[PDB]
Amino acid sequence: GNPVICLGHHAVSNGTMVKTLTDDQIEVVTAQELVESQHLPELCPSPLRLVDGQTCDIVNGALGSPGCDHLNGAEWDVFIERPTAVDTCYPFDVPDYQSLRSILANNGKFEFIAEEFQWNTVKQNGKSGACKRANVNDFFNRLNWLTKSDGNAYPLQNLTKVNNGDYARLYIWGVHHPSTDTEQTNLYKNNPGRVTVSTQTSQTSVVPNIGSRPWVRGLSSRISFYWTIVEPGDLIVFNTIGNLIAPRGHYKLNSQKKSTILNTAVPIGSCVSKCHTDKGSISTTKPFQNISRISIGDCPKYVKQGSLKLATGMRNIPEIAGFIENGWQGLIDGWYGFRHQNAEGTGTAADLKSTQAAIDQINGKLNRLIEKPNEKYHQIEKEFEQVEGRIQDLEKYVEDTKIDLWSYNAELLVALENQHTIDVTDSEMNKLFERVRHQLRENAEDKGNGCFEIFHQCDNSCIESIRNGTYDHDIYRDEAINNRFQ
Amino acid sequence: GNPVICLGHHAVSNGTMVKTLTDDQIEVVTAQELVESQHLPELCPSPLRLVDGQTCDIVNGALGSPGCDHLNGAEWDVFIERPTAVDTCYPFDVPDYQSLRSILANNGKFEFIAEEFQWNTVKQNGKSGACKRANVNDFFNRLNWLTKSDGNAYPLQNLTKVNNGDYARLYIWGVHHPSTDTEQTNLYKNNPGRVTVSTQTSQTSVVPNIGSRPWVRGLSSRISFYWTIVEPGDLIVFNTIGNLIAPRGHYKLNSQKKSTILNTAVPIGSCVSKCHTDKGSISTTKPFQNISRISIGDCPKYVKQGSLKLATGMRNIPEIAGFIENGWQGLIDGWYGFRHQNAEGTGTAADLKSTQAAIDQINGKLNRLIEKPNEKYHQIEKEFEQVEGRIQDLEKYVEDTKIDLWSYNAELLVALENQHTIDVTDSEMNKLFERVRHQLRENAEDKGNGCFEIFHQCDNSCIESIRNGTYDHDIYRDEAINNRFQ
Amino acid sequence: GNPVICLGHHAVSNGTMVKTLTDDQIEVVTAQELVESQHLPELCPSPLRLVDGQTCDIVNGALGSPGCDHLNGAEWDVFIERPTAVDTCYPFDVPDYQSLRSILANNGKFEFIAEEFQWNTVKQNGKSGACKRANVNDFFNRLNWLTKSDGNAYPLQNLTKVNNGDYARLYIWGVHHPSTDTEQTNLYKNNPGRVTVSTQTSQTSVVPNIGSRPWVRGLSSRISFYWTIVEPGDLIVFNTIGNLIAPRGHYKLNSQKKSTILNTAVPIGSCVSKCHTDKGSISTTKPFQNISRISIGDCPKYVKQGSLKLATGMRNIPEGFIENGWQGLIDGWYGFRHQNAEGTGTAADLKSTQAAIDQINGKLNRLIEKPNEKYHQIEKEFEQVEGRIQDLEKYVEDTKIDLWSYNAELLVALENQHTIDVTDSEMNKLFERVRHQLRENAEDKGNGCFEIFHQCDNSCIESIRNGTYDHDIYRDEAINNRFQ
Numbered sequence A, B: 001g002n003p004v005i006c007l008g009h010h011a012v013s014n015g016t017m018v019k020t021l022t023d024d025q026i027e028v029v030t031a032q033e034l035v036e037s038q039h040l041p042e043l044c045p046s047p048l049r050l051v052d053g054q055t056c057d058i059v060n061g062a063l064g065s066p067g068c069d070h071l072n073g074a075e076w077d078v079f080i081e082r083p084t085a086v087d088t089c090y091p092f093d094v095p096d097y098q099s100l101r102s103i104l105a106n107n108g109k110f111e112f113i114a115e116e117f118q119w120n121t122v123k124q125n126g127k128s129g130a131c132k133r134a135n136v137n138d139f140f141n142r143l144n145w146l147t148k149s150d151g152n153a154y155p156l157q158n159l160t161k162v163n164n165g166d167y168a169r170l171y172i173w174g175v176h177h178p179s180t181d182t183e184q185t186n187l188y189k190n191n192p193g194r195v196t197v198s199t200q201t202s203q204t205s206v207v208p209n210i211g212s213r214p215w216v217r218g219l220s221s222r223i224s225f226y227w228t229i230v231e232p233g234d235l236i237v238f239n240t241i242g243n244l245i246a247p248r249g250h251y252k253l254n255s256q257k258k259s260t261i262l263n264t265a266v267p268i269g270s271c272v273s274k275c276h277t278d279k280g281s282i283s284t285t286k287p288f289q290n291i292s293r294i295s296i297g298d299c300p301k302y303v304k305q306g307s308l309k310l311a312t313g314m315r316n317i318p319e320i321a322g323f324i325e326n327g328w329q330g331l332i333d334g335w336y337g338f339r340h341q342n343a344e345g346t347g348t349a350a351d352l353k354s355t356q357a358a359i360d361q362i363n364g365k366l367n368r369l370i371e372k373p374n375e376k377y378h379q380i381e382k383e384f385e386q387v388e389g390r391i392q393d394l395e396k397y398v399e400d401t402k403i404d405l406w407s408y409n410a411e412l413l414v415a416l417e418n419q420h421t422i423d424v425t426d427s428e429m430n431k432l433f434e435r436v437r438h439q440l441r442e443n444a445e446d447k448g449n450g451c452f453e454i455f456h457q458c459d460n461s462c463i464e465s466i467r468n469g470t471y472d473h474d475i476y477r478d479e480a481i482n483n484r485f486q
Numbered sequence C: 001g002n003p004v005i006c007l008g009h010h011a012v013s014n015g016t017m018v019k020t021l022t023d024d025q026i027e028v029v030t031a032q033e034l035v036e037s038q039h040l041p042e043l044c045p046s047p048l049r050l051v052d053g054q055t056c057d058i059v060n061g062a063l064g065s066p067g068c069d070h071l072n073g074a075e076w077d078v079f080i081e082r083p084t085a086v087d088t089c090y091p092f093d094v095p096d097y098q099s100l101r102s103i104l105a106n107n108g109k110f111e112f113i114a115e116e117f118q119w120n121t122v123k124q125n126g127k128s129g130a131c132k133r134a135n136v137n138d139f140f141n142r143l144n145w146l147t148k149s150d151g152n153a154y155p156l157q158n159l160t161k162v163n164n165g166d167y168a169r170l171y172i173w174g175v176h177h178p179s180t181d182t183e184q185t186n187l188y189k190n191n192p193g194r195v196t197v198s199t200q201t202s203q204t205s206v207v208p209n210i211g212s213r214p215w216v217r218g219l220s221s222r223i224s225f226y227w228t229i230v231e232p233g234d235l236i237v238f239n240t241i242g243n244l245i246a247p248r249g250h251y252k253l254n255s256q257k258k259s260t261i262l263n264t265a266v267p268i269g270s271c272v273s274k275c276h277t278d279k280g281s282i283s284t285t286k287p288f289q290n291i292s293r294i295s296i297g298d299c300p301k302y303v304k305q306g307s308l309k310l311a312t313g314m315r316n317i318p319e320g321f322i323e324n325g326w327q328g329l330i331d332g333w334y335g336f337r338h339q340n341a342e343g344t345g346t347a348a349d350l351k352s353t354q355a356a357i358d359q360i361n362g363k364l365n366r367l368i369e370k371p372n373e374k375y376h377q378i379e380k381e382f383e384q385v386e387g388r389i390q391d392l393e394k395y396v397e398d399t400k401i402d403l404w405s406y407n408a409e410l411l412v413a414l415e416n417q418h419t420i421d422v423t424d425s426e427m428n429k430l431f432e433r434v435r436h437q438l439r440e441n442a443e444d445k446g447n448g449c450f451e452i453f454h455q456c457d458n459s460c461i462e463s464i465r466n467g468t469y470d471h472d473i474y475r476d477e478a479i480n481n482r483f484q
């Protein structure tokens, strides 16, 4: 005969490379980036409740150093701690520092309950030139520096507090470390001193350390802070013959501990986001991010890859003939379509049903990549100033392992998605072609290039009947059969 | 040019929604749940060896507290520790309690070897009103409370035990802390006392802490317990001038520790199962469970999902015409089938080569799926009464991380399986169609809807020859061609 | 119409079983093992830097014990610690030994920087019979044992070292624990002694514990060792009235610690490899290994599986509705088998074969792509039980190995099912490519053979195989033989 109908698919001048199981660069018409690499320049104060430490890290917040008054009564989902935090009080350290920091941050509030402690015969409310408050010598406002009396006495202290409330209590207490033996006896009479804090099932006892040390805020002495949790029904004893930095009460512990801490210089802005990193919040719908392993809230999974491209279109093939060799750059209002050549000339029209089928499957894939919120809050430290050994080895190894596994998952996921997407769109093309083959029945012959040679005169109107499925092959059959075989 | 034979597949009234990579809800004929949500109200005492602590926790078992005698000589894969266990002996604490408990649990037995310690001049076998056995004062039966002689003497003790055997020895010993100086001298004469326990490479020196503890069951005196492991070829030394709570021997350590502990109130039953949780045993062949992260033995992976349905059958399309886009609800003795209409009438017959090819490919998925061990005994603690800091944060993070990784694995796997199953069953339908097409050769024409218009006369005789593959096309070729093209 | 043309695929006498999502046993033509099970009987000294401790473990190397001098100035990616290392000096303990060992190992070098400490009036360079060099009393050569002068004098020592360099400093110092009070006053005059070491950001003090320990190398006394890190800008104060075992300088810390330690008896050889285990180096391109969970460098992932076979060819069918495969076909994967008047024959199609070959090579190189290098990890074997921290360390590693073993199983199954589907798809594509070359001049026998309904000599048979055969020329002849 001579009128020809072709089936084919769209194509663009320049597409995007994606990966599959079998190769790392297959060009497809459209693609979607799955790794978020952009963050906001600020931290969003909504909807998570953020509290800014400003000059106070969370530990001198609990101790009550000068400049930390704004944190009294505070409640947070995320405590924002500044790397710029400045010391304003007595030089201290904290054995197992990170555990106290963790407990304070996880707890999520500063609610202090003043208690009267009947210390006997010793001086109270010791103050320091290294801890000026409102330009006067002062001290941590949650702590009480006991010293020997003017009569030169420091008798054994032995105070019990019973937890008969309905919440667990957190006591913070310290041990003072003088610079010389002379200082030890000048302050506490007894040498050595001893600080002992006991519950029903535990006991921390500390012998003070004596010796000259580097000047810190003018001083060679130090305080080491410790803490004790007291469950309801439990008791705590404070027992000393010297060097106790006494609590003035206790912090309330929440039963549910759901909060956390983020150490970052990034300012708090006005945006809205439930995902925070140390580099700023993230506002995205992508499932992965390469911005930071440190993240909090409703977040994308951290991976090592800078880019993972999800195919959102069929394979892109460059350019009458059908789909067996090429794609059609001219087809721009559909994914698949008909190209014809008859007496009245040529033309191209899109096929809606096959185009809509391929699009629905791709959107389906996209929606499935929207995971339900898997909100994470208190996790583990992921950056460290200096080496510590065993426990830090374990922490870095855990995070390193986790990241490798998720990066693998991401990599395999997009390869599998893309392989299927390509097969799905290849399959929609062949089904379109099969549909028409069966429409034409014995009236036409498969040319092999995705085109049917039709063996009867075919109108522009006869073409239209083929494309909308009203073509009745019986009408043309007699004529067609003997155009074909004779 | 009149008979029609159609190929199709079964369909049911109400299928089951499953998931693929592309779809959140696609309907299949049958499906299998992969997440176990049901557990037994009991713990199964076989094939794992369970020991019921009953009234004693495992640490009290090791010390030999009153009420713990049933544990003498016990061996276990899993020690069942009851939440209702109470302290019945002398008030004690254990500095690294969690680790002592873990070591005892992991070791898997209470095999005590008595040793005679030739203590000099001190009284042995001290007993107490705080540790009654049958309303008579007693003590931990693995421990030996040394006190001063009637002659008011507590001479230096210096006793050595060399390990010349072939296993490592666990020694448990304690230090007693009196309430007052008077109690100290009444018991041990010397004040202060000291206890020093050494091996070749290690030394533990404890100075008692007098009068710094709150009351427990009316006593503010307390014992602190320690442990020492002695490798073969090594030795242990006990050196004390007071307050030593001496061991009566040592426990044997198993160099291949593979036991653990489970804290639960769930009674031991008479079921059979290799998987235990704090909620009770699980008896299933499903590969996943959402019951508890605390599981021991040969267990299904714990996941977050409440349900993951695995398709065990083709797509369900409920409701003269073959398979192209609906299915036959009256096909019940096969998965795929022939439906015909000729002069003699109508009929449906199942094809079984096709039906079995599909079932065999599905069945294999299930056996691959429900396959190999997951043999895990001693793990880590996974629930916590109260925050502790760094190490517990790391323990929680490791577990939470593991669960997300397994939940992802479960989610993906079921989607991959279901996508494959759906392609497999679709493929089988089309292989069946192609088989018949190539049987008929030029005697029939593809009607486009999964049917063949047969252009010769065809009774029930030749219908079955089509269905059993004996149909000779050449017999009717002349008749059939004549009807096709005239 | 009776010449017949057929399309099929290669087969072999016997090939290899593989696994997919559905079956644990599907025979394919060729396959590749993805799990390395063989190691070298030695450790490769290239291209990573290995340093052999010999008789010296790393902690003694840091202290400068006899037999560790060869470690002076050493730099490593992997410190090789021998299980037969023994103590050769004063008996000592290190509180948190494992952390010191780990820091020394991770740091990756023994770059010691000597300093003059102007100790006042005390005697220096004390030696012991328990620490013999040649055959003379000696000592840890990084340490300086201070004792009272000849005039019974040990004045308070108070020495400062300021860090005005651009690297963190590691100081290792010690506290001596005498066996008796008489030994204490004999050595240090004062009783008790006191050792206090402090920076701006950390402080400690150690009161010596006087008492007898079990005899070791003729002594009941002990030294306990400590370390202190001093950052740039910080400084350190050594303050003492007795029992200090003084540093003679400090070690330099790299800002970028990239090294680790391997404890193994395996000898260092002459081979080349970038993956090391406790059982020897591994030289392989395979992505997985079942040799050891302890591995360092550029290594395959450790998995529990002994074997994971990846299909590198199509299903192997002996001797669908293609027959099975052709064993006669051995210069391609897919080909043509015909029979006309002048005889039979078989030829291989290039593209279909090459297309399948290319897609399979693609998998292989995506698989064997394989970078990221891991050095310092965690300890994975333990001599005695410890409780909590060791429990977590073992649990982490167990979890990791399970997850990766699962990944390996899933991956191979997915690749195999795809490799099979692709190679069957390429067969069927070759078929209906030919179908459209014949048009109306041939029919589908239903077994992959086209009944050519016209006289088809060797040279129309080739014409089909080069894409030239014109279906017009024989159309009338064909139709006449088909319907007549």
Ligand SMILES: *[C@@H]1O[C@H](CO)[C@@H](O)[C@H](O)[C@H]1NC(C)=O
Binding pocket: A037, A290, A291, A292, A305, A306, A307
């Ligand atoms: C994330 O990836 C982008 C490009 O994909 C890259 O430019 C950026 O450096 C990456 N971010 C990090 C923190 O590596």
Ligand SMILES: *[C@@H]1O[C@H](CO)[C@@H](O)[C@H](O)[C@H]1NC(C)=O
Binding pocket: B156, B158, B159, B160, C212
């Ligand atoms: C204790 O026994 C050990 C080993 O027999 C011995 O070396 C030491 O001198 C003894 N101590 C006393 C005080 O007798």
Ligand SMILES: *[C@@H]1O[C@H](CO)[C@@H](O)[C@H](O)[C@H]1NC(C)=O
Binding pocket: A156, A158, A160, A237, B179, B180, B210, B211, B212, B213, B214, B215, B220
């Ligand atoms: C300290 O108080 C406890 C009870 O609160 C008491 O048992 C103990 O004896 C007291 N300490 C002294 C040295 O008396």
Ligand SMILES: *[C@@H]1O[C@H](CO)[C@@H](O)[C@H](O)[C@H]1NC(C)=O
Binding pocket: B037, B290, B291, B305, B306, B307
């Ligand atoms: C487990 O899943 C079932 C549904 O299959 C749900 O009803 C149940 O609440 C889940 N259990 C837990 C502990 O979440």
Ligand SMILES: *[C@@H]1O[C@H](CO)[C@@H](O)[C@H](O)[C@H]1NC(C)=O
Binding pocket: A212, A213, A214, A215, C158, C159, C160, C237
């Ligand atoms: C001890 O050394 C410190 C640190 O340099 C110094 O500040 C202090 O004054 C010294 N004390 C003396 C020399 O008595």
Ligand SMILES: *[C@@H]1O[C@H](CO)[C@@H](O)[C@H](O)[C@H]1NC(C)=O
Binding pocket: C037, C290, C291, C292, C305, C306, C307
């Ligand atoms: C590794 O797998 C091989 C099988 O290829 C097996 O023979 C060998 O025992 C395995 N190695 C180990 C250490 O289990």
